[PDB]
């Protein structure tokens, strides 16, 4: 299913934001002379990918290019030359983190809760496809419509060999404040290391795009977590909601919740939003001629 693309099928118009891990252009693609245009997002990764690195980005894109779930962003086409290029259905509303941050006032508790479900759903699918997204966070979730979020990719997901449960990343730059502890101390990432980032990410939306462990150097998130500190109760959060997050930040990772469970809970709290989420002011929110 993985479309391998000709550098001359898509024209990358403008730069749409760019990290030092990658750079995302927008973003128009037209298949082999085929008719007209479908606006895509071009993710181009950056740091010199080894032969083993590429196999990995490959394998996952074979999977990413074949997703059926609505809450995971499906790959369109990849474009190897001297650089990688993922072709993505363009998402206009965009980075969700940056959405809640400035639609703060009008975001209901119904949205917050569904979003969580959707995400938990996307993430659940990616688990059933042996994937280990290794990069789930609020910035990494996209808005189709304000009532429909999809999880996007940028190469960091890793495909799991049938008879494996582990994964041992190499080195380099990691989102440290969203990672579990094995991940941090051990460069080990699994499906539970993945739920832990579900934790941070839901805390991230409950605090309305507030910054995790703010004021504290990544240099010892390691120890704060080692001492026993986690992310604070968000203000809008009744105990029920919030110790579901604080379940995801447990040390031993086999006993963090599973996305399959995580789906039920938030799905039930979802058909009863205000009973769990309290947001002050919630109930309102040529031819013709002269």
């Amino acid at each position: 299913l993985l479309r391998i693309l000709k550098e001359t099928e898509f024209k990358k118009i403008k730069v749409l934001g760019s990290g030092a891990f990658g750079t995302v252009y927008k973003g128009l693609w037209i298949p082999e002379g085929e008719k007209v245009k479908i606006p895509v997002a071009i993710k181009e990764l950056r740091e010199a990918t080894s032969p083993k690195a590429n196999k990995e980005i490959l394998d996952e894109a074979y999977v990413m290019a074949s997703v059926d779930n609505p809450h995971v962003c499906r790959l369109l086409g990849i474009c190897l030359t001297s650089t990688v290029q993922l072709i993505m259905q363009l998402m206009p509303f965009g980075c969700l983190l940056d959405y809640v941050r400035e639609h703060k006032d009008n975001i209901g508790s119904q949205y917050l809760l569904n979003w969580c479900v959707q995400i938990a759903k996307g993430m659940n699918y990616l688990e059933d496809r042996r994937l280990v997204h290794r990069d789930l966070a609020a910035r990494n979730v996209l808005v189709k419509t304000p009532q429909h979020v999809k999880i996007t990719d940028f190469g960091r997901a890793k495909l799991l060999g049938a008879e494996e449960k582990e994964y041992h990343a190499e080195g380099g730059k990691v989102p440290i404040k969203w990672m579990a502890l094995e991940s941090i101390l051990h460069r080990i990432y699994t499906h539970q290391s993945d739920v832990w980032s579900y934790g941070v990410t839901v805390w991230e939306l409950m605090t309305f795009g507030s910054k995790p462990y703010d004021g504290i150097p990544a240099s010892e998130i390691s120890s704060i977590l080692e001492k026993g500190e986690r992310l604070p109760q968000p203000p809008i959060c009744t105990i029920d909601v919030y110790m579901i997050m604080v379940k995801c930040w447990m040390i031993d990772a086999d006993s963090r919740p599973k996305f399959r469970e995580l789906i039920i809970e938030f799905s039930k709290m979802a058909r009863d939003p205000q009973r769990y989420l309290v947001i002050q002011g919630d109930e309102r929110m040529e031819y013709l001629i002269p």
Binding site: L181, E226, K227, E229, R230, Q233, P235, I239, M250, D252
Partner: peptide, 30 residues
Amino acid sequence: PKSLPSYLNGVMPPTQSFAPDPKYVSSKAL
């Protein structure tokens, strides 16, 4: 139906502890 926090005029601590919950504090151990 409302067991929210108690935060003073709102603010939130950088981190909240769960020590000595052995399930959260990590046997360093050292």
